[PDB]
């Protein structure tokens, strides 16, 4: 339709295409000053049936353009009232490519590395892929602040159920575990995320690299010690130890990420 107004409307009309015309010449003029950040959330993470924790054009991301010389608190603040949640409930993990390239999320002091600049952490990457890390709708209602995080001894393992009946990879979460923690210990938490009976025998792996995944034959050691290179993004990969495994097309995880990479 043909524009109609009254002269108070349509000067505010004006007033408003020239303010939108005039960010946006500042904004052309000022993008070499300005940088992409791609946040990802954990519900893109289930779902996902490839290596790592999402397929690269898959995944859907809330996209930031932040200034380069801007303090990662400074970022921190301006998510965590566009988000919708408090900076006590949120922590970013930023998606770092590994030497096997893989891209999986890597350890950043929220606290200590605040006031450090948005382009030094990146390390002058365009875009930055973060990924966002927040307490369940249920728990963080109910007062609950994320838990304590220690760089020194704490790691933060992601856990992938296989299912052979079913051909697929069941998302379970992360945790955050000390390095010093058993194997066997982390048993009852795989099984509870994954809907097992307590108990339930269970073949672990670890998703290293796509085509490499490697076997945890001993339980009764550390994570440390079962895991080569142990860092915060390393992948767990468990399935239940049942005989009727062995009828379906691919009875193994390792059977399952081999089948994958010769896709």
């Avoid at 015309?21 to 049936?49: N, P, S, T, W």
């Avoid at 603040?77 to 409930?89: A, H, I, K």
């Avoid at 949120?90 to 450090?116: C, H, V, Y």
């Avoid at 992601?158 to 048993?187: A, V």
């Amino acid at each position: 339709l043909v524009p109609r107004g009254s002269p108070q409307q349509l000067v505010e009309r004006l007033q408003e295409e020239k303010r939108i015309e005039a960010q946006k010449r500042k904004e052309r003029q000022e993008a070499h000053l300005y940088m992409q950040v791609q946040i990802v959330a954990e519900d893109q993470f289930c779902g996902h049936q490839g290596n790592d924790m999402y397929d690269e054009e898959k995944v859907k991301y809330t996209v930031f353009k932040v200034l380069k010389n801007s303090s990662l608190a400074e970022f921190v603040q301006s998510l965590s009232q566009t988000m919708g949640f408090p900076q006590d409930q949120i922590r970013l993990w930023p998606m770092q490519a590994r030497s096997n390239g893989t891209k999986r999320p890597a350890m950043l002091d929220n606290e200590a590395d605040g006031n450090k600049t948005m382009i030094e952490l990146s390390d002058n990457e365009n875009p930055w892929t973060i990924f966002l890390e927040t307490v369940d709708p249920e728990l963080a209602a109910s007062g609950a602040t994320l838990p304590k995080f220690d760089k020194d001894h704490d790691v933060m393992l992601f856990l992938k159920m296989y299912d052979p009946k079913t051909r697929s990879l069941n998302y379970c979460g992360h945790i955050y575990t000390p390095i010093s923690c058993k194997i066997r210990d982390l048993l009852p938490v795989m099984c509870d995320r994954a809907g097992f009976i307590q108990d339930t025998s269970l073949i672990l792996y670890e998703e290293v690299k796509p085509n490499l995944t490697e076997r945890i034959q001993d339980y009764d050691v550390s994570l440390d010690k079962a895991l080569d290179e142990l860092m915060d993004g390393d992948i767990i990969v468990f399935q239940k130890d049942d005989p009727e495994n062995d009828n379906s097309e691919l009875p193994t995880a390792k059977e399952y990420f081999r089948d994958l990479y010769h896709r």
